[PDB]
């Protein structure tokens, strides 16, 4: 992913304000609610029967923390997303067989969650920079399919 220094600055500044404990769970939870077939990959996570159950599910919150951590790792090394995500790509593609459109969906759900949290601060240029990031992350996760 090629971000301008200005775009990288905008992205990094906003991410510094993202709640490490909650935002990943909010994004994963909304993925499960908005695109319900994704729940099939999370049988062991317990109660996903209603939107409230999903968003309150402790395992969803905990797993979401890991997801956010991976986006964070992506941001730390935008010039090597493929290498950063190689083990995760093997898992999601070779082991789990997640269809890669779902990687795009989760990235865009995260973008919606950032807009929800930050309101007017999530300007169109800030969004555009984030879209480069989540597209790069989705591509890196899908690398074993390519």
């Amino acid at each position: 992913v090629h971000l301008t220094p200005e775009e990288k600055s905008a992205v990094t500044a906003l991410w510094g304000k993202v709640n490490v404990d909650e935002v990943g769970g909010e994004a994963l939870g909304r993925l499960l609610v908005v695109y319900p077939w994704t729940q099939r990959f999370f049988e062991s996570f317990g109660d996903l029967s209603t939107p409230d159950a999903v968003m309150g599910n402790p395992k969803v919150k905990a797993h979401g923390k890991k997801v956010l951590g991976a986006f964070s790792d992506g941001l730390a090394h935008l010039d090597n997303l493929k290498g950063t995500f190689a083990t995760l790509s093997e898992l999601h593609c070779d082991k789990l067989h997640v269809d890669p459109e779902n990687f795009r969906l989760l990235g865009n759900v995260l973008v919606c969650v950032l807009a929800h949290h930050f309101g007017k601060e999530f300007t169109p240029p800030v969004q555009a920079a984030y879209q480069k990031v989540v597209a790069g992350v989705a591509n890196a996760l899908a690398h074993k399919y390519h």
Binding site: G29, R30, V33, V34, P51, V54, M55, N108, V111, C112, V113, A115, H116, F118, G119, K120, F122, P124, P125, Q127, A128, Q131
Partner: protein, 141 residues
């Protein structure tokens, strides 16, 4: 296919747009053009600059079309037949572009309507915009 709860959620959420229709529609277009520059190809002679009055005017048309879709949500192909002919027959818009604008409409609603944009309403809005997109990308005359 929308559930009864989906229709309830959409009518309630979109109903809060009101006189901000032009503003929100324009912001969603600007987000799309900036984030996904390939979409600009469909507007070769538009002023697509930030704050453009032309995008503001177009934003109102899009938003008003969504209002029309809500008021006809059980019979949308007949209500949007003119828009389907425009987008599918005349302009031949690739379906992917509707996913991009739909996403940008969701981002816009999330940024302006924090209390309304719950996970359930988010889900319903996404299905609604996907249904509108299917109609506008279909040829059914």
């Amino acid at each position: 296919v929308l559930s009864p709860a989906d229709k309830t959620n959409v009518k309630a959420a979109w109903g809060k747009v009101g006189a901000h229709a032009g503003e929100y529609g324009a912001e969603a277009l600007e987000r799309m053009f900036l984030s996904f520059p390939t979409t600009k190809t469909y507007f070769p002679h538009f002023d697509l600059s930030h704050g453009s009055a032309q995008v503001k005017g177009h934003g109102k048309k899009v938003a008003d079309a969504l209002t029309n879709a809500v008021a006809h949500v059980d019979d949308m192909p007949n209500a949007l037949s003119a828009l389907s002919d425009l987008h599918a027959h005349k302009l031949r818009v690739d379906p992917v572009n509707f996913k991009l604008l739909s996403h940008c409409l969701l981002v816009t609603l999330a940024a302006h309507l924090p209390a309304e944009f719950t996970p359930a309403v988010h889900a319903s809005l996404d299905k609604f915009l996907a249904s509108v997109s299917t109609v506008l990308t279909s040829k059914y005359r």
